[PDB]
Design a protein around this nucleic acid. Structure first.
Length: 721
DNA sequence: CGCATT
DNA sequence: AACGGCTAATGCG
């Protein structure tokens, strides 16, 4: 299988290198015949001879146009004839492209900023990570000596740890009596020892946590300081450090540097992204943190080195465990988009869809539109109307059904053929008109993006059905990842349409999807109210909560299923309303804030989780929510708040339930102090603060839906007037 | 202007 | 390597 591609220069000519792993054998294939090129639209074909003589200079070397060739392509459906301009080296393109564009006879230029190695994968039809090859992985981490006022890597590396299927080990240059610690004489010997491990193990994947911005950079400065050749690459190269905006990225040639940090940063939402917090959230097991001060103190005093070595070992162990959990998913994402695992794992949603579209456009001989210039980019900052949000019906509701559209926005794109190549296309016999915005979309032929979206949904069904027949549980998990990633990719087209930097940006397409969405959700609401007597309690972009106030649970279920049969026969194309779930009771506090409970007694809460909060505020909110959702007792929920505020005012609440966590700082507010130093016998907490700034704000938002003000929840201080 | 829901 | 800065809008604190 293909791992990655790049290029080196030999005598001024680019040489593509294809890194492959076939039958357990690492291979490098070379291609010296791939020519870099760009397209040029000319107003007069006779002018091509003047364009061929355009020259530029890179670094003393004179840049010229090797040859030109007139080709026929499509541009947003319409046929086009453009000039394919060939060059010697891909770096010639940034040097002459501006001079070619500024030439009077040149209308515009296209596909001039596509990286050579990525242009190769697309043009050759090569797909990375495709096949049944098993990759050998190795995780690693480092521990360093830190002092407050010193430069980067001014202190030596104290330890280097690594982990794989064989277990985790630590290399250090001090005596630590642990079975997994290997003791060498110096820091230089420790680094050299690590290089031998990587060389002997020969892993296909090197797994780190923030290795892009710390580990590799620290090792590099240290090897330079000590005179060590940091050859980690399979071709004897040192790790290549690149600039990715305000951060860095590292690639180890011949292998895949899998940095878990950017991956987990996009996949899950956590308050902090320390290795300890990430591991505890994904595996549900704790991990102790050992800070730089403790490691420096332990190394200088020589006491407590077992704790530092154990921390170093756990870093490599958990990085390997997390890598084992997230790498197969990233491999399926890589194979789907058609780009290397290295790039896809570090790429944003907008870049992932663009690379998928770039490949599909090449397959269909479709000329790709350019990225926007600064002027066009400023024009695209105008926003549009989004989803519809109904103001919720106050009060507690019984027997609620949640109905929503199956993939509303992708269904709209496919059903109404929403695409820049079908937008206001004159000469068609059939059109679909977007409500409110009025954009017309030709229905005579399938559009570029709706056709790809249709192929994605078809491919997803072909992978869902292959899962059911697969006996191999490893292959089933892999297919589950591909199927999930196709759903995520399909649901990224809408946002991409309104992404100002996108090549296939189309505000008209984006606002037409939301206008159609607003129409389908609003018409279905009036339909269920007028023809079925339902009360719609709350609705967001693609779904709504409804009930029949004077009806039993079986009655509401039956009528909801009858309504579904009714509207689904009226909905066009792929649009489909579904029965998402039934809820015993629920309250809709404000827009985006609500809570429901199913027949199993599982409570689902949105917008109420909420920042640094004391355990007393979290406890009372949960107690209030439970009284309302499980007991159906709103008056009990108010008494709980009155009881809590009364206990706080009379100082009957233990200080342990008043700690606020925000390094995590654990403090308590006095009548501003770390909780370790707080003494109830000497000091007094601010009862007013914990009532007015903690308990009441957390609960008020919930009880406001039932008609209670903040004053309706404070302790009844009896004023004997 | 942050953070959450869609 | 000379592309990437992180898809959208609505709406509560």
């Amino acid at each position: 299988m293909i791992l990655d591609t790049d290029y080196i220069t030999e005598d001024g000519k680019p040489v593509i290198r294809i890194f492959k792993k076939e039958n357990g054998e690492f291979k490098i294939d070379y291609d010296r015949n791939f020519e870099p090129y760009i397209y040029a639209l000319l107003k007069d074909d006779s002018a091509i001879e003047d364009v061929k003589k355009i020259t530029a200079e890179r670094h003393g070397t004179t840049v010229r146009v090797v040859r030109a060739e007139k080709v026929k392509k499509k541009f947003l459906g319409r046929p086009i004839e453009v000039w394919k301009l060939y060059f010697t080296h891909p770096q010639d393109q940034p040097a002459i492209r501006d001079k070619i564009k500024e030439h009077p006879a040149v209308v515009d230029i296209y596909e001039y900023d596509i990286p050579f190695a990525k242009r190769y994968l697309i043009d050759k039809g090569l797909i990375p990570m495709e096949g049944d090859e098993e990759l050998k992985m190795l995780a690693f981490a480092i521990a360093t000596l830190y002092h407050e006022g010193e430069e980067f890597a001014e202190g030596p590396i104290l330890m280097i740890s690594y982990a794989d299927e064989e277990g985790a080990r630590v290399i250090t240059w001090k005596n630590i009596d642990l079975p997994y610690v290997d003791v060498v004489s110096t820091e230089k010997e420790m680094i050299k020892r690590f290089l031998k491990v990587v060389k002997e193990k020969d892993p296909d994947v090197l797994i780190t946590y923030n290795g892009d911005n710390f580990d590799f950079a620290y090792l590099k400065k240290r090897s330079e300081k000590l005179g060590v050749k940091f050859i980690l690459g399979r071709e004897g190269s040192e790790p290549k450090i690149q600039r990715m905006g305000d951060r860095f990225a590292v690639e180890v040639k011949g292998r895949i540097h899998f940095d878990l940090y950017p991956v987990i940063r996009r996949t899950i939402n956590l308050p902090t992204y320390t290795l300890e917090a990430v591991y505890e959230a994904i595996f549900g097991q704790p991990k102790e943190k050992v800070y730089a001060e403790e490691i420096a103190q332990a190394w200088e005093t020589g006491e407590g080195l077992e704790r530092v070595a154990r921390y170093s070992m756990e870093d490599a162990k958990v990085t390997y465990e997390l890598g084992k959990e997230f790498f197969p998913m990233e491999a399926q994402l890589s194979r789907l988009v058609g780009q290397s695992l290295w790039d896809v794992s570090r790429s944003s949603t907008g870049n992932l869809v663009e690379w998928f579209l770039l490949r599909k456009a090449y397959e269909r001989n479709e000329l790709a539109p350019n990225k926007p210039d600064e002027r066009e980019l400023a024009r695209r900052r105008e926003s549009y109307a989004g989803g519809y949000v109904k103001e919720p019906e106050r009060g507690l509701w019984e027997n609620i059904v949640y109905l929503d559209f199956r993939s509303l926005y992708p269904s709209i794109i496919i059903t109404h053929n929403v695409s820049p190549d079908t937008l206001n296309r004159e000469g068609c016999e059939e059109y679909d008109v977007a409500p409110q915005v009025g954009h017309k979309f030709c229905k005579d032929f399938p559009g570029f993006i709706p056709s790809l979206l249709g192929d994605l949904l078809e491919e997803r069904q072909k992978v869902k059905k292959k899962m059911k027949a697969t006996i191999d549980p490893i292959e089933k998990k892999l297919l589950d990842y591909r199927q999930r990633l196709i759903k995520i990719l399909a649901n990224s087209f809408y946002g991409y349409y309104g992404y100002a930097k996108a090549r296939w940006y189309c505000k008209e397409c984006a606002e037409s999807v939301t206008a159609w969405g607003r129409q389908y959700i609003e018409t279905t609401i009036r339909e269920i109210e007028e023809k079925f007597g339902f009360k719609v309690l709350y609705a967001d972009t693609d779904g709504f909560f409804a009930t029949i106030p004077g009806a039993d649970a079986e009655t509401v279920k039956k009528k909801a299923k009858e309504f579904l049969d009714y509207i689904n026969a009226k909905l066009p194309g792929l649009l489909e309303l579904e029965y998402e779930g039934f809820y015993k009771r629920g309250f809709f506090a404000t827009k985006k804030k609500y809570a429901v409970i199913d027949e199993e007694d599982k409570i689902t809460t949105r917008g109420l989780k909420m920042r640094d909060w004391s355990e007393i505020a979290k406890e009372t909110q949960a107690r209030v929510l439970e009284a309302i959702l499980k007991h159906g007792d709103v008056e009990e929920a108010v008494r709980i708040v009155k009881e809590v505020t009364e206990k706080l005012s009379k100082y009957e609440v233990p200080p342990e339930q008043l700690v606020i966590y925000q390094t995590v700082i654990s403090y308590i507010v006095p009548k501003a102090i770390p909780f370790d130093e707080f003494d109830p016998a000497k000091h007094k907490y601010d009862a007013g603060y914990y009532i007015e700034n903690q308990v009441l704000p957390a609960v008020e938002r919930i009880l406001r839906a039932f008609g209670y003000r903040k004053e309706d929840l404070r302790y009844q201080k009896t004023r004997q007037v």
